[PDB]
Amino acid sequence: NISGKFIQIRQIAGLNSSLKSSGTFKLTNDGSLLWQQQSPIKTTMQMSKNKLTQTIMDNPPTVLTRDDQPIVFTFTSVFMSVFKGDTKTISEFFNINFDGNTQNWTITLTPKSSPLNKAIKEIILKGNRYITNIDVADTQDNIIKIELFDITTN
């Protein structure tokens, strides 16, 4: 069971500023991800096996489907896979380039096939003992940059 903090910066090509958010995450080896945005507005994303639910503030949660938010499902899959050493699943959907060692590594992912290669240009992961950075670039010049820190395993 793994938990940490994140800072997210979303750069959308047409907006005149970047959107910054932050919070915490919790992974179990049971297959669950809790992604809790704490700033600037509270939101919760919870992934269990094949189910993703979203809660905005105190509103009722809603169930997200793969057809509606594909990058969200893809990011969750890659994120969980990296923490468990699951390059097999990543490879089913992505070309993988591993650069470096344990003191420092960078993994470049590019999607293998359509339709994922129409939506994602590349995903870059960097880390040492744990992932430190994830960057998701779409095919429309938008980028999401995530920094992970204060990771603990108890």
How was this entry determined? X-ray
Judge contact between 148 and 5, C-beta under 8 A: yes
Q: For 105-139, give one letter per residue: b (16+ CB within 10 A) or e.
A: eebebebeeeeeeeebbbbbbbbeeebbebebbbe
Cα 7–chain centre separation: 12
E strand or H helix at 81: helix 70-84
Strand partners, 22: 7, 39
Cα 57–chain centre separation: 21
What residues are designated binding site for Mg(2+)?
Answer: 67-68
Judge contact between 95 and 109, C-beta under 8 A: yes
What residues are designated binding site?
Answer: 67-68
Query: Structure resolution in Å?
Result: 1.8
- Any idea which architecture 2-153 has in CATH? Clam (2.50)
The whole-angstrom separation of Cα 54 and Cα 2 is 21
**Which tokens go with 74?**
């893809």
Three-state SS at 17: coil
**Number of residues assigned to the chain:** 154
* HEC profile of 122-137: EEEEEECCCEEEEEEE
Judge contact between 24 and 4, C-beta under 8 A: yes
Q: Where are the domains of the chain?
A: 2-153
**Which tokens go with 140?**
């429309």
Residue with tokens 């993988």: 96
Residue with tokens 């650069």: 99
